[PDB]
Amino acid sequence: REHLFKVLVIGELGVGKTSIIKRYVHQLFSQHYRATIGVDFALKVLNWDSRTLVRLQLWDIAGLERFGNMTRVYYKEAVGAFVVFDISRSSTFEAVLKWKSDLDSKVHLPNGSPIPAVLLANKCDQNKDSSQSPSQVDQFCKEHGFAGWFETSAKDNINIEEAARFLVEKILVNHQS
């Protein structure tokens, strides 16, 4: 058996969304910023069991797009999401709730329940703009319907593989019950 999952990657500008995806899929990173024009896509293939394999459709959504009108279209029939913020810019953390509202505003799993979301504190190879504790972030997640969270770095390949896996699990658990 094989699966195809639509997974969103969302969050403010310059946060690393594209870079994460690019690392996770092609093991590359660039310091150079090129802002995403509307929506970008990438495909990830996974040998999960030997029973089973998963195609991951990654929908890289530009941070600007939450001020436009297109997100309803982009989000449709998504089965999971990363929401991402820059650990060295607290502005971007305040903003994750706006994305999360937007998301849950506009997509449910077929049974009416909000899709699995995983939070990503990106650029952890850098210095904390905010001293918020892991403990607080743990609380936050439970309070706002996030299945999980990870300090990540696109630059230094940290926790991306792990967060991907964590999410896919949650997804598979929904698509066998």
Partner: protein
């Protein structure tokens, strides 16, 4: 007096064609809500989706797919909106087409001339397109009417190489 979305000029352009080729997404929403036929076809077989993909308007392209536009309609030259997006290297639109559909996107559909989208992307050497196509399973073997594969249609050695990479 309100809109008539079924209006035609003498090249078979609906409002929805015009709306698409301008880029006016809000106008699309409106026309569709008023009963506009999304897969309406002009005098040479072009859907609003064909016009968006030609012109390179990813936003519109997606909104049309969102409103159920078929990506497999062939114009008078046998071109899908994907074929058009490939001949004009709108990679952003190509990707929308390939990934929207969830898998049920065929990359093997031949043109008039037998050309798949990959043939076209190779001819005009559009690396980003080419990679996108291959990554989602475009064939390198399919031959067109001239019996040339997409390999043989490549513009450079650069490109040829990128294609053999998967082969």
């Amino acid at each position: 007096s309100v809109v008539t979305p079924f209006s035609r000029d003498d090249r078979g352009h609906t409002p929805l064609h015009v709306a698409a080729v301008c880029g006016q997404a809000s106008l699309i929403d409106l026309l569709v809500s008023k009963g506009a036929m999304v897969n309406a076809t002009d005098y040479h077989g072009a859907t609003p989706l064909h016009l968006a993909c030609q012109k390179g308007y990813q936003s519109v392209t997606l909104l049309l797919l969102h409103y159920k536009a078929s990506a497999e309609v062939q114009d008078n030259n046998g071109n899908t909106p994907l074929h058009l997006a490939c001949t004009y290297g709108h990679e952003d639109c190509v990707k929308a087409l390939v990934y929207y559909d969830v898998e049920s996107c065929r990359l093997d559909i031949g043109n008039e001339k037998g050309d798949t989208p990959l043939h076209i992307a190779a001819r005009w050497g559009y690396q980003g397109v080419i990679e996108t196509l291959l990554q989602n399973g475009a064939s390198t073997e399919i031959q067109n009417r001239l019996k040339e594969t997409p390999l043989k249609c490549a513009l450079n050695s650069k490109i040829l190489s990128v294609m053999e990479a998967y082969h």
